[PDB]
Symmetry: D3
Subunit: 307 residues, 6 copies
């Protein structure tokens, strides 16, 4: 009754979810021209079934987005009972506001695209802004990496009871403040000026940079230096979405990080090769658990505060 | 060609907007049962015209929302060319995210309700979150009180060049940093720890509390006391939306606020009587200008910076 | 698999339906500001479930309507399998036509609001006009109080075999005529003139005023006098929706009514206090029965001609 | 800028409307197979224009409805600025409610069909029920033959000042009372009792049967006989829509009707031949005027009262 | 859980499908005025059920289309779980493109009509163009008569291993080419010139005209002559949709056809009377099989390449 | 009033269109991460204007499609009066049917994506299938290169009066027959038999290969060889869309083609360098003219025939 399909080419995160559910991934033959025009042929019947399409990648976002959208459509047109998009890292999520300029809210566009494509339900992790849920009329489940992050912290940082959770930007205050209270520790905010400033005591404490996403890593690297200047004994960085475009890993090796921790929301195998500082938290259990519970009609909320 | 109608009973802000445009308000007969069931009858032909309904109030939020929605329907059903909702303060704007519980996203409900009522375009001021624009498929113009707020600070606060802009909660971080930078001054945050802390220096300087909206005033009140304990010379409070429910007036009079600044986004004549500390920035010119420029096809974006 | 939630504060009619189904009402925490801005947090998981939200009240129609709309939304966004609005008295139902004026068809607006909010199905009683069903694209079940009214008549009025069913207005002719034929008795119509006239023999017969709704009661009280002037031995009034705004009960005690009968579609406990003439028919069995049968996939039509 | 097209084969009413406006009808080539499959080709550019398709007929209601729908599609698909459906008689208008059975609401289907075909606005005369306006989300203008009907009565019925306006069924109560009041005269109702009664006095006066539409004429025929038995001097019959199927003509000739009044909402030249009693009120001026004023942005509401 | 209703009056194809499924057809009372205005009353409850409405006919396409649309609506409004339109011959299917003229794409209109009427799923046979599937957002299953046609060929034409599949028009090339490869034989195309030309060797071979549809038969009759002139020993014609308007059967008897084969997608009983050349393939097994499998959630694709 | 924007990096075709109209292109700042996440900021006010976004490219089809979609959103969200997509080559146009497998209809996805992005109208050239127009509810103008192609043949091919127009697959039958007739010459088809045949005579005459689009060129290449074996004097190849991936250039240089004709629907400057045989028909005048006439309200249909 339940079927899991993998988009992209990285069937890694997909397979783990499949394994944890006692299932194999559905057959998909995918052809691509030099145009990167994507052809999909669902290798098996999904009529009357509860279909889950997992999208992992974020290396070529437009190819990946279109591949997902095409698959959703193929399944919806083949009489699937329900089509759920499992998008651990939500594409164009940083484009959720106009910011005083004639910009698109591309995250709303993407949400409209997923909707008009045939998605009935969305399972995602750590929306860049929670308000992105409101870009849908279908239900969205926004899972938190926090519980697993909270857990990683207590087990890997001896000093966690005396640390400071730091936000690298002004927008991330609520997240770090929500984590700092749970752990019962200090918080601190960094803000890049529109002409980097830190607010909060970080002195003689290990500082933990927490954000939902890292990309070029300019921000976290600069915040790392800034924190050490402020008297932090060491700096960690925990981010759920580790995009790591180009220079990011050269920068991670150059900056004084104890470790940069991410979830496998995005494939990290190749990056861990040329970067020893990177550690990965496996979030496939949470996803597998969201899927299993969506299909059974159980509470997926347990996953908001339990691993 | 242009037509301006007032929802509510508070002709207050609408009349000024009609004035700045050399217009009178359209004839409306609105009848209300003891039930509060709202009857509306448009007293002239809107056929083919550019309709602007101004909803000012926030005293009975469900009443005023229904009144506005019904007026939109009536106009759209009477062959209006365009129907534009002028909502200086967007109702249910705080409810823009689930926030880790089985809660509704009520600001998305409102957006959908306005849309299905026949809204073509929206004009509003300081959306509690920028991403609410994304809750629509119709164009949204979100104006800023910021210029008028910067203007006020510089001209009414002698010590402003060395003040600290303070966010009463961790949510308004982006807001105070943007003001703090434009004014090239310091920021600081306050946070109620889930069992009240201050990050950033405020000592021997004036602190300005900046928030988008206030209601009961409890938060800005306990924030002002924390600020006073931290050695701020004096505390100001600037809000673009001044709801001021129940205890707010006394609490504003009793607490240490130098002054309390609001806009006439929400009627403030009654509150002025019982409270001397309050200053009101008239925003009718900005709104009037957004209307003139929506109708003409001109750049309302100039209003993001020019008073 | 089935869950019942109560909106409003009057959990009375809700509980009875819950009892008749061997169920308890779902947990809902509701917060309201002085603004009457409504916050809802569904206290339990509704994922995959068949959710029924009962709305009773009609005292503050806009608060009640918004509370319902918010709850529907909360449930739809929490992955409910189906959300059914159980609205015994349909709000703004009297606003179902333009009536030669620039009015809204607010009943259509309300229907659009319920739709865009996430309702999948509607269960209601005695639509002011049957055509309101057509304001939806979702299915609507319009239950009739008639069977229970027919029953109340045969059991409480000794003379029922020789009575006259009277319509207080020209619009209610079809209803009273449908009831008069069943019982095998006379009908009679009243009409207020646009400068009160009765058509039909009422002489030496007990007259029964039948309408779907009573409010201020001006109409039924004036019709009561008119009927007695016409030679009616006594006058009853049976109405399914007993709003009873302000003066209505002072008027009921003043006019020569034998009894005014309503259904508990609207809470009558407080009104029966200062009014002895008021009697209530319990319609919770019909509603409980509509719900039980919607969820099981049985015929709810039996309830159109059986109690 | 304006463009008027005729659906059907009955150029009859369209040509007059085009005349009153100083316009010729747009070139249409419509081809029909023995199948009655309708082919339509627009014979000139409608790109950027205000299109008005006039559908007059009601001889083969499915044919004429499809023809009209296809013409709308064609124009909307050829970049017409606006497409307006002129349907003097709204098809399936009687089917506006389930009426206690598993029936469709076909007038809501029609509304939806017209809308999804690309209709922007509707002009119609005497909707069988006002609430049908609610079946749309597009603007509806519903014109009245009433003024033209009042006008006719006063000028053609000598006894009119003491006549009785009679509704042939209980449904048309509101209709006859509105006419009866405007003329300051008596009303009366007729009802076929579900196993024919008259309520109201008609004795020694002329009775005018008023209904919105007639078809087979059985109802107005048995009504006229009841009226004659009740001692009406003479019986008139006034309908805005004269469908007149099969037996209608003979039955109108045989029965006692002084005259039978209709509008040219539906073609009446053929029926005039075989039936001398029939009088036709031309409504082309009213329709022509609704079009002129929809296009200009003027008050069509003046047509609710001014001939 | 599954219900089959027959539209039209031809309950023939409907009954066969019903028989093959161990089911009786649902009760439908249908009233029609001289107007051909269609009334439907579903004689039994369809609440929670999987409803299938079969439309056979194509004699009066607009009556048939409206009857279907009305039934879908009646069922959707009576709380059917799912409504599937089983339309063996898709109406207006030949109107799927603009063809360099201001025409409607009526097939898209029809698809929009079926959608807005309440259909959730479509089962059809041999779409005139496969692209018509894309006129929907609901799923469409386009069954092929080919497997049964392939079978009929091997069993009724001794020479099938040496025949030529001929397309009567340029648009039908893909179909005949797909059939010619399966059988492992030649193909040939005919094209009527815009001032009839054949491409391909037909000499000393039995030629088989294959198209999806035949109507007046002008085309196939003219192609038959043309093929015999080209040296074909005999000519067959296999078409899935045998409309056979007026002259078609007089023409079939006059032209040198060995046999004209159609499916009973359209009623052929009356036409086989005055035409001996006509043979019918029963496709009720394929349809019954599509229905049975849609409802069970099995693969209906087996029916694309198996009888 | 008019505004022309260029999507992509290929200002190539847009600039010419802007030239032919006496316009400059609107200011756009588009920023792209290594991710290929597309950021777009409109550099001037489009409020109230007629927007035309030109998307030329087809080098990275997902990139260019996303870029175009985002630009549409941005403009529609900035109060543009109308947004029109100019897509000379419609992306995913080949995927217009399931074709007997569980495939998506990706050209319908694209249509839906463009629509939900805020597209009001579309201008395109030679849709791979006419029925794709049906995939929209918005107006589509589908222009032909045909006149420009006929023009080219007559003027560049000496032998044209006795040439044969050849379709490289069985799909393009309609295409080559339409050209063959207009030119009053012969047609012929080629077909790869599913285990390459030619139907129609080509011997001792020039064969022109006509197709709508080519990519790898394999099909037109094996077609040219078949044609050469059949005794065509020389082979030409005419395509309206010249994608030319990977091996296409060498294969065009090595194979026997006299010349290869394309339009500048897709950029062709790079391909010209490495390939001498290629001729390009500039279509900027046709597109420029469709824009001028969409904006003015003029007949773009004249472009179906007049160069």
């Amino acid at each position: 009754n339940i079927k899991i399909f993998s988009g992209s080419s990285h069937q890694d995160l997909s397979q783990k979810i499949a394994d944890r559910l006692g299932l194999e991934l559905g057959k998909v033959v995918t052809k691509k021209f030099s145009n990167q025009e994507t052809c999909v042929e669902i290798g098996e019947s999904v009529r009357g079934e509860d279909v889950y399409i997992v999208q992992s990648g974020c290396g070529e976002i437009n190819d990946n987005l279109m591949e997902l959208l095409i698959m959703i459509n193929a399944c919806k047109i083949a009489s699937a009972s329900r089509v759920t998009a499992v998008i651990p890292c939500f594409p164009y999520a940083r484009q959720d506001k106009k910011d005083k300029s004639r910009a698109p809210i591309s995250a709303k566009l993407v949400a409209n695209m997923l909707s008009v494509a045939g998605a009935d339900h969305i399972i995602t992790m750590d929306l860049h802004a929670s308000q992105i849920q409101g870009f849908f009329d279908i239900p969205v489940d926004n899972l938190y990496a926090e519980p697993a992050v909270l857990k990683w912290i207590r087990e890997n940082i001896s000093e966690w009871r005396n640390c400071t959770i730091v936000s690298p930007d002004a927008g991330g205050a609520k997240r770090v403040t929500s984590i700092a209270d749970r752990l019962n520790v200090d918080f601190a905010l960094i803000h890049k000026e529109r002409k980097m400033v830190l607010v909060g005591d970080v002195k003689d404490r290990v500082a933990i940079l927490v954000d939902d996403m890292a990309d070029t890593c300019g921000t976290i690297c600069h915040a790392a230096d800034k924190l050490l200047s402020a008297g932090a004994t060491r700096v960690y960085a925990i981010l759920t979405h580790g995009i790591f475009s180009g220079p990011a890993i050269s920068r991670i090796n150059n900056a004084c990080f104890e470790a940069v921790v991410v979830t496998n929301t995005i494939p990290q195998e190749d990056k861990m090769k040329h970067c020893s500082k990177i550690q990965v938290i496996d979030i496939s259990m949470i996803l597998a658990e969201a899927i299993r519970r969506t299909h059974n009609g159980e509470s997926v909320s347990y996953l908001f505060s339990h691993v």
